[PDB]
Structure 1
């Protein structure tokens, strides 16, 4: 089989939008459900309104702010504001540099992941009520007429578990693309169990990114592809073929091009040539929305001997829309951490949550999130009924954060005891 566009790593399983009033474009806190950052979220919504029949004329969006802030979360929110079945690809800037492929190639794949081709074709979709789901190191679904048990690999399990599907859910599964859609519920949206045949052939909409189309029409990457000498670049012939056929489809009217969102984190890692590529791409009508994130105030423009804010060329800076994010108040931190905790299946004691909030204040959100699971395991080894403050403290004394880490390593050569020493 093949694969549809979503396929949207995803450690932010709590974002359906910007938490913003449809008309007022006004950010309501903790809705959809991303917390705080109302200014930056509203700014994002305005940018998106400036994209729909926009006066923006192909500009990039720069989100800058301190680390452990929802700039990435906001990026995904913007991705969701365009609706599902819309290509969204994330990418750390430093990923552009590797031996596996060239900068041009990596950028090309990254951009072609953000542009989807949407057609109307027939497919064998399933629709039914989920009976059972299992785990390993198999899905049981029935209708009012029949019951069946299917097998599935890592991709399918990931896709279903991402859609928050459990026992009792009425869902739909495309056997061609693997696109799972939760229709509703039969008990504690209340739908009734579908009738007739479980597997029906319907004429559905299929969106598939250009890169995915390239991969499908290429030699399928062998098992243990990462650990073999086999690279990852795509032959120019295949690309030309795909581009030509897509062009013919667009001329005919069979396919419709749907631009998406490309998100480049720590964009300050990119050099001049990369920004040349990105700028040249933004001129094509098929170009997706390019959102970049930055943790640095002022950085060196890589490739040259000049410095600039966030490490962007001045020319590029004059053409971007900047959205700024801010540190979180303790409440927002506690809320975010709790949301992140209930999705990691970790039952926390209020004191443990508060302590984790303080840890989040002093070290950052990512570190606290990292401490959640470790705390869960420490509580598990304890046969603890719940993850108390003791477990969090223990994991905190066991797994250090970067600051305490470099401090501890530097402690091998102390600087004072009675007086400063150097």
Structure 2
């Protein structure tokens, strides 16, 4: 079974057909107003019409901001790009902060390009030095003339006659994958591996659909790895490093992708950028986000913040309602997440127990909920697996109240530790 994370139980938003939030569905409990707003946000993302619309999930810690963002990701599906990031990731040592933000903006736009892959495959018969090589398959044999670059690739693979090779003419890549199974009996022992002859035609064209971000195209065109020529090869020896991709390159990639969409050989899938802790950005990043969010190419961007009225990073004494400057709060829609009632906390704990494969009795669940009315919800949830381990060690297959009490005696919460220190 896959490992259980903090948000594994979240399968979606749990909205009905009319888009009202059910009290307990799809992992989420309560938070109806925020769930309905995230529903409207999901519709906004699915419409693919608006660029650069930003939303901020703002609320106290433990109120489901990241759960709601991941629920949006679940409702969208795997087809729609979703780029989770943290504001503290912008402090690269390699590229400037604005470039990191822009690269995340470009990651969140996806592109399905249908590409025709043509392949020459077979067992080599002749390797006459441009080269007139021959390939033989289960059907027949053909003679082909290829660029000297393909011959140099064959020499790189050290292909000898009688070997089964795979040539992708699009990328000029050759894969020698074995010696033909016909030769597999000639010697009682040889170091090579044998593989059957190919079953199709020598020259085969297959149509495939490739999923890429705009960021992939940008980085591929910025640092080319496909030159297969002396100068590009000498450049490839250099240590890899992120570079500040220019606006000219991105404009060219935009034009190429527009041509692809016009030809019908590609479809563009606007996705989401998610910045989980936006208050770790500084004033330079927020100022850049002004221009970035006003762009017509930008994705739908989601922010989450748990700070009160605190000081904006990169400034001296400027305080703002969430640590985000007032100029950027004007450009975002705000979704508020509220604190939980005890009953909602108990429902969340029960869901977490069922997700963690843990059986818990009603009395133990009630004591855990009472502990969670103190301390925090996350503390109370985190006591499930220690208590189930102590149950298993004591030979019980369910958490009892005594096991919860003992685990709460072994492990203290933040408030208790602060009281001890103070």
TM-score w.r.t. the length of structure 2 is 0.64
Are 1:403 and 2:415 an aligned pair? yes
Bigger helix share: 2
Structure 2 residue aligned with 1:69: 63
**Among candidates 325, 345, 356, match of residue 313 of structure 1:** 325
**Among candidates 57, 80, 84, match of residue 86 of structure 1:** 80
Q: Counterparts of 1:271-310 in structure 2 under 5 Å? A: 271-304=282-315, 305-310=317-322
Measure how far apart 1:272 and its partner are.
Answer: 1.0
**Among candidates 397, 400, 419, match of residue 385 of structure 1:** 397
Measure how far apart 1:117 and its partner are.
Answer: 2.0
**Among candidates 109, 114, 117, match of residue 108 of structure 2:** 114
Q: Distance in 1 between matches of 2:240 and 2:312?
A: 28
Work out whether residues 51 and 295 of structure 2, in 8 Å CA contact, stay in contact via their aligned partners in 1.
no
CA RMSD of aligned residues (A): 3.6
Structure 2 residue aligned with 1:16: 11
Q: Distance in 2 between matches of 1:233 and 1:30?
A: 47
Work out whether residues 387 and 404 of structure 2, in 8 Å CA contact, stay in contact via their aligned partners in 1.
yes
Distance 1:388-1:49 versus aligned 2 partners, 3 A rule: same
Distance 1:213-1:383 versus aligned 2 partners, 3 A rule: farther
Measure how far apart 1:324 and its partner are.
Answer: 0.8
Secondary structure, counterpart of 2:383 in structure 1:
helix
Measure how far apart 1:216 and its partner are.
Answer: 8.3
Structure 1 residue aligned with 2:211: 207
Secondary structure, counterpart of 1:277 in structure 2:
helix
Are 1:333 and 2:345 an aligned pair? yes
The structure having more radius of gyration, on CA atoms, is 2
Work out whether residues 63 and 323 of structure 1, in 8 Å CA contact, stay in contact via their aligned partners in 2.
yes
Q: Distance in 1 between matches of 2:324 and 2:240?
A: 28
Unaligned runs of 5+ in 2: 118-204, 226-238
Work out whether residues 19 and 27 of structure 1, in 8 Å CA contact, stay in contact via their aligned partners in 2.
yes
Structure 2 residue aligned with 1:144: none
Structure 2 residue aligned with 1:158: none
Q: Distance in 1 between matches of 2:79 and 2:49?
A: 25
The alignment of Structure 1 onto Structure 2 pairs a total of residues equal to: 315
Work out whether residues 37 and 326 of structure 1, in 8 Å CA contact, stay in contact via their aligned partners in 2.
yes
Q: Distance in 2 between matches of 1:337 and 1:202?
A: 51
Q: Distance in 2 between matches of 1:384 and 1:100?
A: 54
Secondary structure, counterpart of 2:274 in structure 1:
strand
Distance 1:303-1:337 versus aligned 2 partners, 3 A rule: same
Distance 1:244-1:11 versus aligned 2 partners, 3 A rule: farther
Secondary structure, counterpart of 1:363 in structure 2:
coil
Q: Distance in 1 between matches of 2:300 and 2:209?
A: 22
Structure 2 residue aligned with 1:188: none
Structure 2 residue aligned with 1:154: none
Q: Which shifted more, 289-298 or 345-354?
A: 345-354
CA deviations over 1:52-101 (Å, ceiling 9, x no partner): 66997633111111111112111222233333311112223233335576
Q: Counterparts of 1:151-300 in structure 2 under 5 Å? A: 205-211=209-215, 234-235=242-243, 244=252, 247-253=255-261, 254-300=265-311
TM-score w.r.t. the length of structure 1 is 0.64
CA deviations over 1:165-201 (Å, ceiling 9, x no partner): xxxxxxxxxxxxxxxxxxxxxxxxxxxxxxxxxxxx9
Q: Which shifted more, 399-408 or 88-97?
A: 88-97
Q: Distance in 2 between matches of 1:204 and 1:10?
A: 34
Distance 1:58-1:346 versus aligned 2 partners, 3 A rule: same
The runs of at least 4 consecutive aligned structure 1 residues that moved more than 6 Å come to 54-57, 201-204, 213-220, 237-243
CA deviations over 1:233-266 (Å, ceiling 9, x no partner): 5345799879856752441233322221222223
Q: Distance in 2 between matches of 1:57 and 1:213?
A: 20
